[PDB]
Amino acid sequence: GSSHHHHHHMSGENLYFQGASAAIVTDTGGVDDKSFNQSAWEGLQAWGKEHNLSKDNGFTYFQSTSEADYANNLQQAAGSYNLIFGVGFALNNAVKDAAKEHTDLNYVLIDDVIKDQKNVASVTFADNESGYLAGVAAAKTTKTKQVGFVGGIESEVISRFEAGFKAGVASVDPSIKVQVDYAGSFGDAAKGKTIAAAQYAAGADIVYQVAGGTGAGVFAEAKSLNESRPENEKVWVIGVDRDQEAEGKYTSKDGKESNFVLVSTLKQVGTTVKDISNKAERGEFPGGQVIVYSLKDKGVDLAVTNLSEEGKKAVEDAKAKILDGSVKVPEK
Numbered sequence: 001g002s003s004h005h006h007h008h009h010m011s012g013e014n015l016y017f018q019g020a021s022a023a024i025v026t027d028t029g030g031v032d033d034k035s036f037n038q039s040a041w042e043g044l045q046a047w048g049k050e051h052n053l054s055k056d057n058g059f060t061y062f063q064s065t066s067e068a069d070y071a072n073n074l075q076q077a078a079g080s081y082n083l084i085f086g087v088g089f090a091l092n093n094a095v096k097d098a099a100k101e102h103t104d105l106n107y108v109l110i111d112d113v114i115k116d117q118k119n120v121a122s123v124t125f126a127d128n129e130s131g132y133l134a135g136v137a138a139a140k141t142t143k144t145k146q147v148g149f150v151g152g153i154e155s156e157v158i159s160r161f162e163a164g165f166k167a168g169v170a171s172v173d174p175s176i177k178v179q180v181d182y183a184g185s186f187g188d189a190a191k192g193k194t195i196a197a198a199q200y201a202a203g204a205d206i207v208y209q210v211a212g213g214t215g216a217g218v219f220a221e222a223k224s225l226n227e228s229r230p231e232n233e234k235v236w237v238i239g240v241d242r243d244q245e246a247e248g249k250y251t252s253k254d255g256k257e258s259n260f261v262l263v264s265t266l267k268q269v270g271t272t273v274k275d276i277s278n279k280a281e282r283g284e285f286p287g288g289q290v291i292v293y294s295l296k297d298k299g300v301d302l303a304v305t306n307l308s309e310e311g312k313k314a315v316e317d318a319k320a321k322i323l324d325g326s327v328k329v330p331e332k
């Protein structure tokens with residue numbers, strides 16, 4: 001206001017900020033998947049450090065054993081936590097039922113939308129846009145003109161990555177074959193390994209793994225192949241969610257230390273967890289809203305890493321065309 005004549009002083013010794021307690025509930029696996037779950041957890045840990053908290057004293061994670069465990073994990077979380085993140089589209093129905101039971105608590109669904117629930121915020125990422133950039137990169141480096149995509153679970157979410165990836169590859173060279181295989185799980189490394197083994201055997205020189213912890217198998221297969229060959233015949237992996245450059249270190253057959261990560265799509269799940277936790281604690285929880293992260297706000301990106309200069313220029317050009325609306329990336 002212009003003036004505030006009726007005012008009273010509050011001494012700093014009497015003032016306090018009321019904190020919140022935040023928990024993530026996993027859709028499958030732990031907080032060491034080197035991707036989705038880990039990004040969320042490092043976010044929550046960073047938030048905890050900023051607020052002088054520690055694990056099980058202000059923040060924690062509940063690992064889900066199956067779909068049947070979602071409801072039980074959310075109900076357990078409601079004992080001590082007043083901000084609860086369902087990390088993954090699979091938690092949709094369970095988060096919806098939990099928010100209706102506990103109208104005094106705040107819930108966040110990561111990667112999916114719940115409508116008409118005042119205590120639920122939804123967060124989506126334009127993974128089609130980051131996928132497109134990964135496709136431009138893949139198309140500018142493949143020598144076999146054959147690339148692979150290993151999906152976790154067939155879904156709207158993984159279809160965004162897949163549609164974006166195909167469109168990006170075709171934007172550079174439509175001749176390039178994309179082999180698509182799904183593991184049917186985000187926590188099945190053994191299946192990631194067999195799919196990657198077959199994709200590489202069928203002549204892919206690059207595999208984009210978009211399957212969470214299932215992707216550990218794709219890294220395992222590419223490492224084994226690359227260790228038993230010369231450096232100049234290595235096959236590539238594209239990283240997902242986190243910059244996975246450090247996961248691609250190996251020694252070739254001819255004793256050269258190298259790296260088989262070409263590029264990584266980024267999905268700033270951690271940053272969203274920290275930002276929404278800060279908003280919940282300040283009493284500004286965005287209940288009932290859908291928060292869309294895209295290339296524009298750097299909620300998704302491509303880490304260029306080991307890409308050729310001509311690759312980086314095609315990526316910069318594709319990014320500019322996505323931001324200005326010149327290129328519309330398909331979501332399916």
Ligand SMILES: Nc1ccn([C@@H]2O[C@H](CO)[C@@H](O)[C@H]2O)c(=O)n1
Pocket residue numbers: 027028029035036037087088089090111152157158186209210211212213240241267
């Ligand atoms: N446990 C997991 C792991 C991953 N995902 C989805 O798969 C994408 C690639 O890791 C992630 O970005 C995410 O969309 C998931 O839904 N649940």
Ligand code: NI
Pocket residue numbers: 001002003004
């Ligand atoms: Ni004023």
Ligand code: NI
Pocket residue numbers: 006007008
């Ligand atoms: Ni007064």
